[model samples]
Target chain A: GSSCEPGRTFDRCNTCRCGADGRSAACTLRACP
Target chain B: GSSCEPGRTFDRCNTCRCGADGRSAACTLRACP
Candidate 1:
């Protein structure tokens, strides 16, 4: 996604750009769905 | 934690201990919660 990056795996997202500045730890995850 | 294993990043579970034989691709995930 444009706001997220891959995590330990190459499919699921770990980091996310949730904040106004595009940096936040409060992001959701999806198993390649 | 008991049924899940760490993911590519660790802490987050990628694998889970499910099914009769204790194997499954259908397990849930937790962020160390």
Candidate 2:
């Protein structure tokens, strides 16, 4: 399973696994929305 | 003797004071710069 996605939270390392290598993910602050 | 002064680190809450009541303050992310 993928641990990262568009709405997924980032860790201290500022990285997230967006499923397989064919997909792309983004990191954003929860408070922004 | 104000605690909400600028350049001073903020607590869990986001707030800062430039100076006295006549001044203005702003909150920004340090990593952005």
Candidate 3:
């Protein structure tokens, strides 16, 4: 499984962040250039 | 804008592929590990 620091943010046409549990990330699809 | 070779493929929880025109990619949300 992928783990990331909680609250660290990134993107892929969606502004996303790591879970507090550090085992998941959530995203919403949107527009990008 | 980003352009990629026609029919090239990649992933981000979606099995995405570049457009034949090399101007876009399409994906469908499904399952991933």
Model 3: lDDT to the true structure = 0.40
- Which runs of model 3 end up more than 4 angstroms from their true locations? A1-12, B1-15, B18-33
lDDT by residue for model 3 (B1-33), tens: 333233333223443344544432454543333
lDDT of 1 by residue, B1-33 (tens): 222222312223333333343323244554543
Residues A1-33 of candidate 1: C-alpha lDDT, one tens digit per residue:
133222222234343334333334254554443
Q: Give the alpha-carbon lDDT of every model.
A: 0.36, 0.30, 0.40
Worst 10 residues of 1 chain B by lDDT: B1-10
**Which of the two, 1 or 2, has more lDDT?**
1
Candidate 2 chain B weakest lDDT stretch, 10 residues: B8-17
Chain B structural similarity as TM-score, candidate 1: 0.23
- Give lDDT tens digits, candidate 3, residues A4-29: 22333332344334555544556566
Give the per-residue lDDT of model 2 (tens digit) for B1-33.
Answer: 232333333222222323333334444333321
TM-score of chain A of 3: 0.34
Against the true chain A, what TM-score does chain A of candidate 2 give?
Answer: 0.18
TM-score of 2: 0.15
- What DockQ does predicted model 2 obtain? 0.02
